[PDB]
Design a protein around this motif. Structure first.
Motif, mmCIF file in Angstrom:
data_model
loop_
_atom_site.group_PDB
_atom_site.id
_atom_site.type_symbol
_atom_site.label_atom_id
_atom_site.label_comp_id
_atom_site.label_asym_id
_atom_site.label_seq_id
_atom_site.Cartn_x
_atom_site.Cartn_y
_atom_site.Cartn_z
ATOM 1 N N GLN A 1 -38.574 28.821 15.695
ATOM 2 C CA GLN A 1 -39.674 27.889 15.858
ATOM 3 C C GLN A 1 -40.218 27.158 14.505
ATOM 4 N N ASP A 2 -39.564 27.472 13.423
ATOM 5 C CA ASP A 2 -39.800 26.953 12.149
ATOM 6 C C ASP A 2 -38.886 25.591 11.815
ATOM 7 N N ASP A 3 -39.216 25.263 10.469
ATOM 8 C CA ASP A 3 -38.438 24.053 9.966
ATOM 9 C C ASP A 3 -37.385 24.516 9.207
ATOM 10 N N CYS A 4 -36.028 24.869 9.967
ATOM 11 C CA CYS A 4 -34.782 25.482 9.516
ATOM 12 C C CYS A 4 -33.849 24.362 8.894
ATOM 13 N N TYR A 5 -33.378 24.362 7.666
ATOM 14 C CA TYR A 5 -32.498 23.623 6.983
ATOM 15 C C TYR A 5 -31.249 23.937 6.617
ATOM 16 N N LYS A 6 -30.052 23.170 6.536
ATOM 17 C CA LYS A 6 -28.804 23.575 5.966
ATOM 18 C C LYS A 6 -28.757 22.949 4.637
ATOM 19 N N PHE A 7 -28.221 23.760 3.637
ATOM 20 C CA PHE A 7 -27.879 23.365 2.298
ATOM 21 C C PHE A 7 -26.719 22.295 2.418
ATOM 22 N N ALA A 8 -26.775 21.130 2.191
ATOM 23 C CA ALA A 8 -25.762 20.257 2.618
ATOM 24 C C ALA A 8 -24.797 19.724 1.483
ATOM 25 N N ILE A 9 -24.772 20.751 0.381
ATOM 26 C CA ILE A 9 -23.637 20.474 -0.688
ATOM 27 C C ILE A 9 -22.693 21.664 -0.360
ATOM 28 N N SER A 10 -21.568 21.427 -0.502
ATOM 29 C CA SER A 10 -20.603 22.386 -0.111
ATOM 30 C C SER A 10 -19.253 22.120 -0.840
ATOM 31 N N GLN A 11 -18.350 23.435 -1.286
ATOM 32 C CA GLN A 11 -17.436 23.029 -1.859
ATOM 33 C C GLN A 11 -16.155 22.473 -1.153
ATOM 34 N N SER A 12 -15.214 22.092 -1.948
ATOM 35 C CA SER A 12 -13.843 21.277 -1.552
ATOM 36 C C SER A 12 -12.801 21.433 -2.138
ATOM 37 N N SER A 13 -11.548 21.247 -1.280
ATOM 38 C CA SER A 13 -10.159 21.223 -2.082
ATOM 39 C C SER A 13 -9.584 20.010 -2.026
ATOM 40 N N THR A 14 -10.367 18.836 -1.231
ATOM 41 C CA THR A 14 -9.933 17.438 -1.448
ATOM 42 C C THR A 14 -10.475 16.717 -2.329
ATOM 43 N N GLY A 15 -11.569 17.089 -2.911
ATOM 44 C CA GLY A 15 -12.187 16.281 -4.052
ATOM 45 C C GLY A 15 -13.640 16.103 -3.538
ATOM 46 N N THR A 16 -14.231 15.316 -4.386
ATOM 47 C CA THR A 16 -15.890 15.046 -4.180
ATOM 48 C C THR A 16 -15.855 14.160 -2.835
ATOM 49 N N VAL A 17 -16.623 14.358 -2.223
ATOM 50 C CA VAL A 17 -16.913 13.555 -0.970
ATOM 51 C C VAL A 17 -18.428 13.357 -0.900
ATOM 52 N N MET A 18 -18.520 11.852 -1.036
ATOM 53 C CA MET A 18 -19.691 11.343 -1.044
ATOM 54 C C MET A 18 -20.279 11.048 0.312
ATOM 55 N N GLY A 19 -20.738 11.792 1.216
ATOM 56 C CA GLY A 19 -21.150 11.791 2.796
ATOM 57 C C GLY A 19 -22.689 11.169 2.791
ATOM 58 N N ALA A 20 -23.042 11.455 3.877
ATOM 59 C CA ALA A 20 -24.132 11.040 4.455
ATOM 60 C C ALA A 20 -25.462 11.524 3.528
ATOM 61 N N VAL A 21 -25.083 12.753 2.736
ATOM 62 C CA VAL A 21 -26.051 13.314 2.006
ATOM 63 C C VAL A 21 -26.477 12.175 0.757
ATOM 64 N N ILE A 22 -25.218 11.602 0.363
ATOM 65 C CA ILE A 22 -25.509 10.555 -0.722
ATOM 66 C C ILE A 22 -25.836 9.613 -0.049
ATOM 67 N N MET A 23 -25.235 8.661 0.874
ATOM 68 C CA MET A 23 -25.202 7.506 1.316
ATOM 69 C C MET A 23 -26.574 7.143 1.750
ATOM 70 N N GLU A 24 -27.321 8.197 2.434
ATOM 71 C CA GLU A 24 -28.852 8.080 3.252
ATOM 72 C C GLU A 24 -30.008 7.723 2.023
ATOM 73 N N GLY A 25 -29.479 7.688 0.693
ATOM 74 C CA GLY A 25 -30.469 7.363 -0.376
ATOM 75 C C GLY A 25 -30.267 5.778 -0.714
ATOM 76 N N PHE A 26 -29.275 5.301 -0.020
ATOM 77 C CA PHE A 26 -28.834 4.104 -0.714
ATOM 78 C C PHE A 26 -28.117 3.072 0.410
ATOM 79 N N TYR A 27 -28.295 1.478 -0.049
ATOM 80 C CA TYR A 27 -27.591 0.687 0.568
ATOM 81 C C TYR A 27 -26.376 0.693 -0.290
#
Ligand SMILES: Cc1cc(C#N)cnc1C(=O)Nc1ccc(F)c([C@]2(C)Cc3c(ccnc3F)C(N)=N2)c1
Length: 378
Positions: free
Chosen positions: A309-335
């Motif tokens: 019933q709480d405010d539960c979050y996922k840590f949305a930084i994660s490891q990768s074998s295909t390189g850096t991916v600048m997903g919605a975590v990045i894009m939501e900060g910016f135009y």
């Protein structure tokens, strides 16, 4: 140029399920909600009554449909889709007033592709022909759009985080951002590839060979939720984020996205979490700029949790074998401006980004950074 009121707020979504635009296929027009994906290059739509789908492309109803008499099979690490290739008349109701003849993969079988409870039934691959399936002769929608009309070769994305946003097609809308746009070269036209030249956790450099930051790729991807980071870089990255936040404890599974973390409602200690800064290659030799995101961006509400019933979050930084991916975590900060004509991507502070009263997302320059060419992998 400068304002496109028709296209403002033309994006919808559910937190974590992606951003979709409304589109029409065939004659007479069939309306579909379509995922906006800068990490792929196929326009692919459900074409059969999968139980998860609100609707699907009915080729039989379209006078303007044409068979290419050719199949396409597209595996991912998570599932797949298979389809039949054709072309038809495509338009975007809340976009430019044109109709184009585009390639369409009519999806006839899939696994783990459509999402149960989602409100979209296709995907619009906005990246380049090089990574189109089956091969680069299959012209992506945006290429078709630009070749066939007078729409300028650029689109911009404001992802607002029910989430919302704008996809301004053929231009930029200055009401969607504050301050200045800063541009990073598109290294190569396949994904939207860029180079990260420096990473700061909380103003503090990670002091890694910048080559690692872009091993083997760094891309801008609206079809990924996370900020994904190469393992070696992810390791160092969380090591430093752990330390910045050791003021409170969390299991080692949380940092691996194997478990959620909850706090009592309105009790998230944002301030115990560091701002994250990527420095990107600039337009000028030895010149870079820096984009700064908040934990608001990388700690993501998980709403659908019935065991709590709480405010539960996922840590949305994660490891990768295909390189850096600048997903919605990045894009939501910016135009974000995909300036295809000039082969560059622009970042500005988004007018809609989620920010508390102490820290704000930032785009700043110029900085002096030497040997940025060395940061790209070959
Ligand atoms: C869950 C989700 C959340 C956000 C948010 N916020 C945005 N998009 C999605 C999403 O459902 N994308 C998606 C689904 C199926 C796909 F097949 C792809 C591909 C084509 C394939 C793909 C991608 C990224 C990571 N690995 C993949 F397999 C990508 N960019 N495109 C993306």
């Amino acid at each position: 140029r400068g304002s496109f009121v028709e296209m403002v707020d033309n994006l919808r979504g559910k937190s974590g399920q992606g951003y979709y635009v409304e589109m029409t296929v065939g004659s007479p027009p069939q309306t579909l909600n379509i995922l906006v994906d800068t990490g792929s290059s196929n326009f692919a739509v459900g074409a059969a009554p999968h139980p998860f789908l609100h609707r699907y492309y009915q080729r039989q109803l379209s006078s303007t449909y044409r068979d290419l008499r050719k199949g396409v099979y597209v595996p991912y690490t998570q599932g797949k889709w298979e389809g039949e290739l054709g072309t038809d008349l495509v338009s975007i109701p809340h976009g430019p007033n044109v109709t184009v003849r585009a390639n369409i993969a009519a999806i006839t079988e899939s696994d783990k592709f459509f999402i149960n409870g989602s409100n979209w039934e296709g995907i619009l691959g906005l990246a380049y022909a090089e990574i189109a399936r089956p091969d680069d002769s299959l012209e992506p929608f945006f290429d078709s759009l630009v070749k066939q009309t007078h729409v300028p070769n650029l689109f911009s994305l404001q992802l607002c985080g029910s989430v919302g946003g704008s996809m301004i097609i053929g231009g930029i809308d200055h009401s969607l951002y504050t301050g200045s746009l800063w541009y990073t070269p598109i290294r190569r036209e396949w994904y939207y590839e860029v180079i990260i030249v420096r990473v700061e956790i909380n103003g503090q450099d990670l002091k890694m060979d910048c080559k690692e930051y872009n091993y083997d790729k760094s891309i801008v991807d609206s079809g990924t939720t996370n900020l994904r980071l190469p393992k070696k870089v992810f390791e160092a990255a969380v090591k430093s984020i752990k330390a910045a936040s050791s003021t409170e404890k969390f299991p080692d599974g949380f940092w691996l996205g194997e478990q959620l973390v909850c706090w009592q409602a309105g009790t998230t200690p944002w301030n115990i979490f560091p701002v994250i800064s990527l420095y990107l290659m600039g337009e000028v030799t030895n010149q870079s700029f820096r984009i700064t995101i908040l934990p608001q961006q990388y700690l993501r509400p998980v709403e659908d949790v019935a065991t709590s019933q709480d405010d539960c979050y996922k840590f949305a930084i994660s490891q990768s074998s295909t390189g850096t991916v600048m997903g919605a975590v990045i894009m939501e900060g910016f135009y974000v401006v995909f300036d295809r004509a000039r082969k560059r991507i622009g970042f500005a502070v988004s007018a809609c980004h989620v920010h508390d009263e102490f820290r704000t997302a930032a785009v700043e320059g110029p900085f002096v950074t030497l040997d940025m060419e060395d940061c790209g992998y070959n």
